[PDB]
Design a protein around this ligand. Structure first.
Ligand SMILES: O=C1CN(c2c(O)cc(-c3cnn4c3CCCC4)cc2F)S(=O)(=O)N1
Length: 298
């Protein structure tokens, strides 16, 4: 193979983009190369109060459908990358009248974890409804037949983990859902450091919630594309590298954009993605004696 390290091709490209100050031109290339696909159901008149933003819609070919409901629509997309054995659902922060649909989808898709990357209020606007209880009262969603109870809360400096009990009233069953809340990632911004984002991702991974024996994890922010796209791109690229593939980050992101529009919203969020993939690749453990020496020396 090549003479460089496993991350050497990506690291050289990052250094060149910095020296030539070409992050804004590269972002514009990606925008111009992203094709549009039909999103007709999202624009039905009966779905207008189910969309948070008029310009952010799921594509018809990859939207998640609600089962046994008169209206099957929710603003959510299935992003499945079988080269990585990874599947995610990316979705908007639910509105007061769509929290009931959010929990129905979580049940029907056999999801184990919800990853939340926004605050409820940001710059004096509401970005997402309060869809889980903060105290010991049960929170009822009568339109779809679900109730939710807080089981535990662990607060750290830049994220919080809640364990939640989700009850299906119609089937007489319950499940424990892990709720991973990143509390210090600003709208259209970046996390405080690669190290802080990576510690959060490794905690999500350690719970088993991203493994193929569970349904897809539900990832959301406010619109479900900027911060959510950054999180999913970094996780996918790290899986492919651990598998041994020689990856091109521009190509992976354009492929993921075929499943949901507009993933990654600023040039700085793109640059942060490169940084987190390089530093995470140095944390990979494996069997190769060569790869271990590269890690020590780097
Ligand atoms: O970093 C990020 C940025 N996000 C984000 C976004 O991408 C788009 C919009 C959006 C779409 N239409 N309109 C607005 C805002 C105001 C008026 C109209 C809002 C957002 F918070 S995000 O996806 O939540 N993660």
């Amino acid at each position: 193979g090549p003479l460089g390290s496993p991350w050497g091709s990506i690291e050289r490209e990052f250094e060149e983009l910095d020296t030539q100050r070409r992050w804004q031109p590269l972002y514009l290339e990606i925008r111009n190369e992203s094709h549009d696909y039909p999103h007709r159901v999202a624009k039905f008149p009966e779905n207008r109060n189910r969309n948070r933003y008029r310009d952010v819609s799921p594509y018809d070919h990859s939207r998640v459908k609600l089962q046994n409901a008169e209206n099957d629509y929710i603003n959510a997309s299935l992003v499945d990358i079988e080269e990585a054995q990874r599947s995610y659902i990316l979705t908007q922060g639910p509105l007061p009248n769509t929290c009931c649909h959010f929990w129905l989808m979580v049940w029907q898709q056999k999801t184990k974890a919800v990853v939340m990357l926004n605050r409820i209020v940001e710059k004096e606007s509401v970005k997402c409804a309060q869809y889980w209880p903060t105290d010991d009262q049960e929170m009822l969603f009568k339109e779809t037949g679900f109730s939710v109870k807080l089981l535990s809360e662990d607060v750290k400096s830049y994220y919080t983990v809640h364990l939640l009990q989700l009850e299906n009233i119609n089937s007489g069953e319950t499940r424990t859902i892990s709720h991973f809340h990143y509390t210090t990632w600003p709208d259209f911004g970046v996390p405080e450091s690669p190290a802080s984002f990576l510690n959060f991702l490794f905690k999500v991974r350690e719970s088993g919630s991203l493994n193929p024996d569970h349904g897809p994890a539900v990832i959301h922010c406010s619109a479900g594309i900027g911060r959510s796209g950054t999180f999913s791109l970094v996780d996918t690229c790290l899986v492919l590298m651990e598998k041994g593939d020689d990856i091109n980050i521009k190509q992976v992101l354009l492929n993921m954009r075929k499943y949901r529009m507009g993933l990654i919203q600023t040039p700085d969020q793109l640059r942060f993605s490169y940084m987190a993939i390089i530093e995470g690749a140095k944390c990979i453990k494996g069997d190769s004696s060569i790869q271990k020496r590269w890690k020590e020396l780097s």
